[PDB]
Write an enzyme that holds these catalytic residues in place. Sequence first.
Site, short mmCIF file in Angstrom:
data_model
loop_
_atom_site.label_atom_id
_atom_site.label_comp_id
_atom_site.label_asym_id
_atom_site.label_seq_id
_atom_site.Cartn_x
_atom_site.Cartn_y
_atom_site.Cartn_z
CG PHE A 272 -4.60 15.75 0.68
CD1 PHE A 272 -3.76 15.89 -0.90
CD2 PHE A 272 -5.95 15.29 0.45
CE1 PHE A 272 -4.34 14.64 -1.17
CE2 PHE A 272 -6.35 14.81 -0.85
CZ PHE A 272 -6.09 14.65 -1.84
CD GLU B 260 -3.15 0.21 0.35
OE1 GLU B 260 -3.26 0.86 -0.33
OE2 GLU B 260 -3.77 -0.83 -1.13
CG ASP B 261 -1.48 4.10 -1.79
OD1 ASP B 261 -1.76 3.01 -0.89
OD2 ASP B 261 -2.04 5.33 -2.19
NE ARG C 27 -2.50 9.55 -10.50
CZ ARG C 27 -2.75 8.54 -9.31
NH1 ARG C 27 -2.47 8.35 -8.20
NH2 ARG C 27 -4.71 8.65 -9.68
CG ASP D 258 -6.73 6.40 5.34
OD1 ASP D 258 -7.14 5.71 5.29
OD2 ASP D 258 -6.70 7.60 4.11
MG LIG Z 1 -3.70 3.10 -1.81
#
Ligand SMILES: [Mg+2]
Lengths: 184, 184, 178, 177
Positions: free
Chosen positions: A156, A103-104, A169, A107
């Site tokens: 963010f 995963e990036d 990105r 949360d």
């Molecule tokens: Mg993700």
Amino acid sequence: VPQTHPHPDVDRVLLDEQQIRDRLAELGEQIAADYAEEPPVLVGVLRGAVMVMADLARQIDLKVEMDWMAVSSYGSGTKSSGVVRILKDLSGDITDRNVLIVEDIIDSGLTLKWLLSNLRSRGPKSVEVAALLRKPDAARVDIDVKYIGFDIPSEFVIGYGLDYAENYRNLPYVGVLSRSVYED
Amino acid sequence: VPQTHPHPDVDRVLLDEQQIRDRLAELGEQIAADYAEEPPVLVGVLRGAVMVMADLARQIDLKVEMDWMAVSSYGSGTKSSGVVRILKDLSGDITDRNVLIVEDIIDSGLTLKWLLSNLRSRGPKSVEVAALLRKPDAARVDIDVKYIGFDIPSEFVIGYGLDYAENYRNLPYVGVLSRSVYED
Amino acid sequence: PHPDVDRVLLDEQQIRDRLAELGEQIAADYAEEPPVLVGVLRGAVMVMADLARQIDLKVEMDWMAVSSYGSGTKSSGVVRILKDLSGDITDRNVLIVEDIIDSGLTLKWLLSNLRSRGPKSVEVAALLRKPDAARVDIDVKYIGFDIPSEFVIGYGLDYAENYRNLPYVGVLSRSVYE
Amino acid sequence: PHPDVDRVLLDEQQIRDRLAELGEQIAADYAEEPPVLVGVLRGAVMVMADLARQIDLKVEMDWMAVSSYGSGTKSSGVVRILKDLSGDITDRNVLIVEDIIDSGLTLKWLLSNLRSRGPKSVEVAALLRKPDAARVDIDVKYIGFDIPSEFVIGYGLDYAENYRNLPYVGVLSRSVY
Ligand SMILES: [Mg+2]
Ligand SMILES: [Mg+2]
Ligand SMILES: [Mg+2]
Ligand SMILES: [Mg+2]
Ligand SMILES: [Mg+2]
Ligand SMILES: [Mg+2]
């Protein structure tokens, strides 16, 4: 860019390119030792996982395989159960395989929990998670994440495959998207 | 076709067009009464479900919706857990909805049980099943099917949306595929 | 009388009679080489299930699902493929079975898409044709009915996901949007 | 030395140096109007992740996933779209980012397919080009390396799903083959 131009001098970099590289080198080694007998299928959810997966994979000295999913929202359902629409499923059967979701970010969103339970319904030997970034509100979802790159504040974030409205990105670092009015 | 031509005069029909239509009319009526307060989302898995879904829907006097899935095999995994690859997922959130899966056949395959558990993980109010056909080996797998058209013998069936090597789906009846050598 | 339906345009028996004629005509035209029937979900469901049964040939059936690319779809007809054809149509006769044709460009684009996949031929059978279909330059070989420019529902056609299960084709009542 | 790799064809540093040059050239050519980078899974993953980071423009990234239609794929290049582009490319510049080009017709079909979706332009950047790529008449604007006709692995490229995570491009050893 001229010095009279009124804009922030440095967009706020949270994790720089070298910090990410060093940390994924450590995670790669730890993952390679933990899976030495049975390499994992690395699973990534597009598009956020692109950079971390391409980089982490190359730091894991095992015969890993790589597989991808694409997902979209089912609106209010996604918020309440984490269910997502599968636009592209896994190409491969995971039956009796070790699977490592890469995963990036994690949360308070429920989609990782729902995806974990989804993959566990497909007969794998085990499913674990490696996440580059973890925010404070990730504590509110009860899931065991075995490998974590960095704890970050609730900002963010953009770059390193993470977007804002499809932009940024391709930044090689993780930055904080500017929110405040800049004043000179 | 000339009478001297060596070919069978009739294909073995298990359920004829009228029998299917009469039985779907009864199922439709029973479904309409059971769901009077809250009409279902009819879910069909392509391609087998096409005829039963088109027809049954039209026998249900309620404001139903219809949605579709497409699936493919994950090989040995599909045989051992029922897991299938989702090639096209539901378009609609089924959170708090009544869902009725409309099947062509049930048997000893695990895919319906896996699909039922997959849809139940998306927060619907209820998921039930209506199936046109049920074979004897369906008894092996413990699932409650609320609406059943016909209990049939263990025969390879074709027609009414069911194929053999993609053929015969447009027969208006359900037939038994013959594999024997025809002799004159 | 259904309260969301203004009036019945085509009743269940008219549709059935017409599809029986179309089926026979299609069966004769493709006697040597049965088509792959292609339907685009979800609007094609009823017409495809019913027409296929009136075609006395060993047809095959395949399906697509599509989403909009927003402004691009309006200007060229391009759509986002959410489910592609499962089968190769190389050197096959293909018959797209449509619910409606009109001034929208998605059919034209789809046709040009399928013709880029090597089929022997691609033709169209459409249950319903509106007047504004004349504005797009495409040859549609089989047409069920010409209908007036009305928003139509039933027989697989929806308004906001409703009314697909009506066994006739109706005109949507303005009381549902006014 | 890896035992499934006969020899290293392009090493990690060579690939990095070249993508740095390509990135720069791309950033100059598209300065007025950044491209949507389009990659076809899974082979494009490494080249796309790396090349995107060498392009100093506000690029976007989009992905496709494809399957074969058997004999049709060989004869026209047509593929079964398992995941389409998420974004409209109408009036956009598009840059398809490829792992390899060769005599296969799929890139030509994909190029023609994207040009049917109204983009302002579609160009190609490919990491590797084999000799038999001359047999297909397509203009490829950006090419990492010409390579010989070998079965190559690593840097996202697999054999039977293995070796995608090698950080170099190798030649697959016939002992595995
Ligand atoms: Mg993700
Ligand atoms: Mg300043
Ligand atoms: Mg079925
Ligand atoms: Mg249509
Ligand atoms: Mg509509
Ligand atoms: Mg490629």
